Design a protein around this ligand. Structure first.
Ligand code: BWD
Ligand code: BWD
Ligand code: ZN
Ligand code: ZN
Ligand code: ZN
Lengths: 258, 258
């Protein structure tokens, strides 16, 4: 059976091709995760169909309703067989789905409009003129919600109580907000995304300070999946053979506009 | 049943305390991995005994006998129940044992005396006045042996046939060779180790250039272990709590003497 792959429209991982209306199926998309999916499939020997997650979310469980949304939910309820996206390997998710070893290492980082007088998370927490937030609904927002580290908890208390909301629906929304704030809005996001945006026109944003944490993105499958073992071995083989480094250069730097 | 943990004396992971002669059992040791073992054991709810791997090796498979040595071999043959050490998650090992998600991210790096006219892997391959090598029975030596990247293979053809052997049995021997070679020997090793040594007196070595790859260290258990699942969730929990960063600071920079 054709393997159903759930993914998310997040540049440069998965994007619509310019003439996608002319194309069909898997040919409608391009990106780092599109290239990765084709390779994982080749190495594991399966045919597949890329589908964009219905609710445009990564994956979180609603307390009360107890229902999982996003790509994680698609795997949990059997709507998809595998998730190939910039999906963070977390404990809460690992309890309901399986993840391959990481295909990309990263950490939460700070994005500023060039010139903003901020060089760390401590800087952000110690002031209030410059607003800041995260991508609503993902692991970055959860990192702050769950943190017991003083600086990060102080940051969470401000963000959750901030009005209007400092949280954004999409990365693009966070980046445009940074770009239009005149330095009055900093954005907390995954490092690899920060580095990508730093190489895109108008070349007016930059990553400052070190990463707030260290983690990774993994390929996810439902628990008990027949694909789990092979998918994991494929990720390790691809990393060892240099393909992963090659894909990042391709979508990040080879195509860099700054 | 008390769990037998296999580990390796590699600083600052596992080191015999200064006051060891007046101590017994697990108390004789200190280090990043000693604190880690204690954390894992507390969270997984088990009692353990730290044992230093019989042959002092990480783990590799004998091409002729098909027999696994090192900590890997201790798990494969059932001599040990879990390996808590700076053991790299690799494809060949993943085929015979299980690994938790990485507790540490790293990459192969270059260690030079200081003043040594080398700044990259390319520089090393462009000349022959300065010798260079790696550790044995490890993922680093394997890396160059399996690499197709022009530079890394050119480096391997030199290392393979190098007279005398540029390979060393332990990190200590590699670092000692760099320090006592008047800058005529550069050492290829894992980044975390490189960074640690750079902060240790005589403060005469330094890490140059970027990492040659991206990998991770994991806690290993034999296939089908009743400990595997719990250990993986424990690693994830410890990373998300902020403990793994706390442990690296403590052993790397809080104790740095440069
Ligand atoms: N990877 C996250 C989603 N995600 C993505 C980006 Br880009 C970010 O900046 N923050 C996030 O939480 C997850 O898995 O929830
Ligand atoms: N982590 C490796 C062992 N190891 C260690 C150090 Br330090 C190094 O520089 N190279 C290695 O291969 C393995 O697991 O084989
Ligand atoms: Zn391939
Ligand atoms: Zn604990
Ligand atoms: Zn032999």
């Amino acid at each position: 059976k054709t393997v159903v792959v759930t993914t998310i429209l997040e540049s440069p991982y998965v994007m619509m091709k310019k003439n996608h209306e002319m194309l069909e199926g898997n040919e409608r998309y391009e990106g780092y995760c599109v290239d990765l999916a084709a390779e994982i499939a080749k190495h594991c020997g399966f045919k597949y169909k890329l589908t964009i997650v219905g609710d445009g979310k990564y994956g979180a469980r609603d307390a009360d309703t107890k229902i999982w949304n996003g790509m994680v939910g698609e795997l949990v309820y059997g709507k998809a067989d595998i998730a190939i996206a910039p999906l963070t390997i977390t404990l809460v998710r690992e309890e309901v789905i399986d993840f391959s070893k990481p295909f990309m290492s990263l950490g939460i980082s700070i994005m500023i409009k060039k010139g903003t007088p901020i060089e760390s998370a401590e800087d952000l927490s110690k002031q209030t003129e410059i607003a800041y937030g995260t991508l609503d609904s993902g692991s970055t927002k959860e990192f702050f919600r769950r943190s017991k580290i003083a600086v990060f908890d102080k940051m969470w208390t401000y963000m959750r109580s901030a009005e209007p909301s400092v949280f954004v629906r999409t990365t693009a929304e966070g980046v445009a907000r940074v770009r239009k704030s005149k330095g009055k809005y900093a954005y907390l996001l995954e490092s690899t995304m920060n580095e990508y945006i730093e190489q895109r026109k108008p070349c007016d944003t930059m990553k400052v300070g070190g990463n707030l944490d260290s983690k990774g993105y993994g390929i996810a499958t439902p628990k008990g999946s027949s694909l789990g073992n092979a998918v994991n071995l494929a990720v390790l083989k691809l990393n060892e053979q240099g393909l992963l480094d090659k894909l990042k250069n391709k979508w990040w730097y080879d195509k860099g506009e700054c």
